[PDB]
DNA sequence: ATTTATGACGT
DNA sequence: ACGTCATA
């Protein structure tokens, strides 16, 4: 009577260093070279936000200043994010992301998780594929970039090991040693190979993927073998996988709650959670978190793949660090106008493309000396896709935040978000 | 001065 | 409504 969280087949697809691949498709000179994408070149060469795998090998990471990355990797090539109205403009990447998600939707139900990753619900697609091929062995040739986590168990080249693990898996499927859920995952992986082939053929982009029974395991699986590969994590693989898996690697446990789990229970690995009762976990972390942890450490999670190919919000913001912090009224107004103009453009395009209208405008700011990402959030009605009205409306709602033709304390961040979409 | 985005939850 | 958390 003990449920095993084996009801669904779920994938998570992550475009490998996505902004970089976009620039590399556009500029063949960047292909197969150590390359990074930077925004804002003046200050320390700019901030790196995406890094090719060739560059990662030199120790280049995101959130590194380009000048610093050049010390680690002198031959590093850089592509700059487009800058419009004095701020980074991510339109090219948003549009490329749409290219990929449109291809994914042909194969299965997708949840847009971010600009560069999507969850995929393959349960239905797997059931249908299982009827078309019935009692036919699944050839290793259908899974040319698939790793089976945990295998092989029992040749000094990675590709050799991959194939040996796959053979062991498939030989035990064909034997009848594995379970029907295992067959379901395997077929799911075949479909993902097919989806990933179609993405590469049609866009030129490569991606890694994880296939498992829920989103957390799929996300975890995806990161196990990168770039351009996919990993199947079976329910059976979970005890060994979790036995040495730091708690912070599991999605949603990378922050404060994860650190609390570690500190309060005196443990380090995900698997160690199984020794606590559900009541115990709830007593420390709350009813929801405790229940979630109890199921998750056993490889079980029920968060559905939401059928949502489009972002629920459309926002833009700009930080104004250090000396650049906004300190006059005219300056604060000029930047609201810049933000509002980008937002109007993206909103109008959204309306035309997606048949919806935003109804709420959220204004957020951060004041100098406040550690919290947001110092304050206020909303007002968004009635007109008009940059001047939007910027003026936003000024109105945050104007009282100023102590006193001058602005103090200085603003270190402005954020306009369009939310609350309705069909149009 | 590691951005500029996102989605979710608690109250 | 508003603040906080988590992710890349």
Swiss-Prot record:
Upper lineage: Eukaryota, Metazoa, Chordata, Craniata, Vertebrata
Effect of residue 63 to G: Increased DNA polymerase activity and translesion bypass compared to wild-type
Enzyme class: transferase
Species whose genome carries this gene: Homo sapiens (Human)
Binding-site list for Mg(2+) 1: 14-15, 116
EC identifiers of the protein: 2.7.7.7
Record: residues binding Mg(2+) 2: 14, 116-117
Name used for this protein in its record: DNA polymerase eta
Ligand binding (a 2'-deoxyribonucleoside 5'-triphosphate): 62
Activity: how regulated: The enzyme in complex with the DNA substrate binds a third divalent metal cation. The binding of this third divalent cation, which is coordinated by water molecules and two oxygen atoms from DNA and dNTP, is essential for catalyzing the DNA synthesis.
Gene it is expressed from: POLH
Function according to Swiss-Prot or TrEMBL: DNA polymerase specifically involved in the DNA repair by translesion synthesis (TLS). Due to low processivity on both damaged and normal DNA, cooperates with the heterotetrameric (REV3L, REV7, POLD2 and POLD3) POLZ complex for complete bypass of DNA lesions. Inserts one or 2 nucleotide(s) opposite the lesion, the primer is further extended by the tetrameric POLZ complex. In the case of 1,2-intrastrand d(GpG)-cisplatin cross-link, inserts dCTP opposite the 3' guanine. Particularly important for the repair of UV-induced pyrimidine dimers.
Catalyzed reaction equations: DNA(n) + a 2'-deoxyribonucleoside 5'-triphosphate = DNA(n+1) + diphosphate
GO CC entries: cytosol; nucleoplasm; nucleus; replication fork; site of double-strand break
